[PDB]
């Protein structure tokens, strides 16, 4: 048994990745990847001559090229902070030395040492004088070490993972270790899209990967470039990409529906899952294809849902696939709770029953089969209720009812829409109060802290921590603040840079041992604190208010996003704590409490 990966030094792959990254145009990256793949294929052809059932493929390098798509390996459990700590421990660097602080505080640009946001670059700079120039580890050895590390993390063995990391460090160069760090973090920043990589690998690699959700099968089956697959569709015990929905236009629904009756159903806040039933065998897969069968169970003898929902299936259903949502049903209130209580599965699609495929069938047939495949039981397994509608008035009424019921929007589907994995809008649309302009109540509040960014926004403030003001005595300004939540998105690069410059000189380092008197924090302490007399009023379109123990106010905003750094309003016009309490009690959580009139 010979493997090509064992004969491929990791240095070649690292050099190819570096060459791809440094290139500015996609043509050079495609050329480099094509050359590397051609060399690998030529080596594969030359190696195996009279051997059948050759299981070797490009998977050993394919997984490394796209670590985010790895599914066979378990979670590493080590990230920038843990990786930096492990590097410090193994290299025996001083705990309080410059290198240790730089590695730990990689985001802080105070060191002004090359890159200030890229952990990989800082690690490479630190390790340049500590490692050799030429490595000796092959791709197969690196993959084996990574699998050992994953098992060690899953096996609760810190010493073994530490030994593996030490071996990797001692048997690799600076560039090789930087690439290993990037792969472990699962962020290579190659600059080439995944679809482009799959197209280069094979003509229909992307479709097969979406259908099967496994790199090994794609690498093995789609090995030869000329020999493709005649057909590709969802298969049993093979996770497939779920079908998502795009933003819904509020006054073009008919134009989106091609002028035919459409289904509208209340949107559910849970977890998207797909269940495969084969006789007495169950396989649960998540939205990204991760295996959840352990939590929900593989057989009726064990699990949290299958042992109780097995009895609901019919006798003439031996092969089945369902796609649905998992929620927490409380029987005391007999209702679902947003993200005693028991797992509940609301199903809305069926892509396969018995020995036939429903992927290409119309939505009406899928709904009929879903209604005639099992008998729902409330609290454990149920079928989403779809209502027919053909006018915008019905859609508006449904949205109004959803808002009044403290729901999270509605979903609209076309009867003739077909199931296409990994398609962001082909007949499925979502209507929520967030999209409609003016329905939500904007929240204008001050800024009291900031954090250093990571990645592209390295040497600047990427996200900020905001606080509301208390109620001061009459004739006096507010000098006490309570942190509300954190905002990182919603600001453009130019606006973010302008805001950072406006407060760059006023920034003050934050010390945990000596928290500021004006700003009082809970569990989250900003890296840099700014006094309130000089600050901007940021507007946030919060979706809902939820109970948070990490902030003094006790509440936080779900899906916060900055809308505008208002300049007309001064720092003293921010919301009051009593105003925040009144807003929270206005609708008991969700801020969307206004109807739509047109």
């Amino acid at each position: 048994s010979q493997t090509v990966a064992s004969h491929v030094p990791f240095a070649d792959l690292c050099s190819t990745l570096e060459r791809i990254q440094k290139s500015k145009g996609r043509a050079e990256k495609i050329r480099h990847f094509r050359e590397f793949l051609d060399s690998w294929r030529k080596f594969h052809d030359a190696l195996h001559k009279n051997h059948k059932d050759v299981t070797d493929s490009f998977y050993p390098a394919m997984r490394l090229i796209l670590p985010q798509l790895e599914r066979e390996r378990m979670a590493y459990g080590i990230k920038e902070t843990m990786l930096a700590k492990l590097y410090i421990e193994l290299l025996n660097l001083p705990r309080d030395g410059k290198d240790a602080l730089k590695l730990l505080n990689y985001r802080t640009p105070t060191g002004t040492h090359g890159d200030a946001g890229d952990f990989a670059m800082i690690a490479y700079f630190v390790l340049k004088p500590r490692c050799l120039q030429k490595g000796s580890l092959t791709i197969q050895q690196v993959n084996d070490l990574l699998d050992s590390i994953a098992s060690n993390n899953s096996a609760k063995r810190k010493d073994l993972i530490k030994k593996s990391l030490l071996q990797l460090i001692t048997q690799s160069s600076a560039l090789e270790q930087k690439w290993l760090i990037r792969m472990i973090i699962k962020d290579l920043k190659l600059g080439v899209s995944q679809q482009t990589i799959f197209s280069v690998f094979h003509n229909d690699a992307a479709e097969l990967h979406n259908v099967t959700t496994d790199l090994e099968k794609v690498c093995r089956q789609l090995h030869d470039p000329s020999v493709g697959l005649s057909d590709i569709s969802i298969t049993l015990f093979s996770a497939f990409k779920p079908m998502l929905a795009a933003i819904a236009d509020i006054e073009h629904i008919e134009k989106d529906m091609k002028h035919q009756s459409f289904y509208i159903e209340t949107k559910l806040d849970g977890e998207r899952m797909q269940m495969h039933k084969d006789g007495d065998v169950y396989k649960y897969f998540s939205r990204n294809g991760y295996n959840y069968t352990d939590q929900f169970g593989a057989s009726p003898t064990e699990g949290s849902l299958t042992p109780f929902i097995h009895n609901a299936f019919k006798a003439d259903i031996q092969i089945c696939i369902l796609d649905g949502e998992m929620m927490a049903y409380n029987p005391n209130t007999q209702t679902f709770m947003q993200k005693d209580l028991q797992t509940c599965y609301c199903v809305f699609d069926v892509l396969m029953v018995n020995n036939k495929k429903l992927g290409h069938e119309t939505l009406r047939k899928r709904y009929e089969i879903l209604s005639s495949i099992f008998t729902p039981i409330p609290g454990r397994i149920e079928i989403v209720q779809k209502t027919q509608a053909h006018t915008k008035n019905e859609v508006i009424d449904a949205l109004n009812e959803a808002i009044d019921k403290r729901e999270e929007g509605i979903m609209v589907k076309q009867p003739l829409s077909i199931y296409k994995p990994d398609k962001r809008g082909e007949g499925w649309l979502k209507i929520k109060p967030e999209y409609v302009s003016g329905l939500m109540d904007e929240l204008d509040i001050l800024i009291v802290g900031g954090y250093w960014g990571k990645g592209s926004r390295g040497g600047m403030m990427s996200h900020f921590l905001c606080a509301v003001a208390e109620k001061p005595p009459p004739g006096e300004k507010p000098s006490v603040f309570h942190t509300l939540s954190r905002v990182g998105s919603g600001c453009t690069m130019k606006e973010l840079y302008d805001l950072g410059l406006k407060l760059a000189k006023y920034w003050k380092p934050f010390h945990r041992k000596a928290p500021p008197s004006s700003i009082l924090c809970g569990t989250e302490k900003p890296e840099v604190y700014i006094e309130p007399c000089n600050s901007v009023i940021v507007q946030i379109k919060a979706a809902e208010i939820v109970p948070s123990d990490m902030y003094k106010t006790g509440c936080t905003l779900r899906f916060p996003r900055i809308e505008k750094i208002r300049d007309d309003k001064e720092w003293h016009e921010c919301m009051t704590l009593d105003d925040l309490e009144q807003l929270r009690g206005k609708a008991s959580g969700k801020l969307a409490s206004k109807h739509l009139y047109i």
Binding site: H7, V8, P9, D12, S15, S39, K42, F43, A46
Partner: peptide, 26 residues
């Protein structure tokens, strides 16, 4: 013969900025 053998290794618009000193000597 091993891995060594199989592996090797006008358009636009011009823009101008006028920088004028405001020193006393000028």
């Amino acid at each position: 013969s091993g891995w060594e053998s199989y592996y090797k290794t006008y358009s636009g618009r011009d823009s101008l900025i006028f920088l004028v000193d405001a020193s006393k000597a000028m």
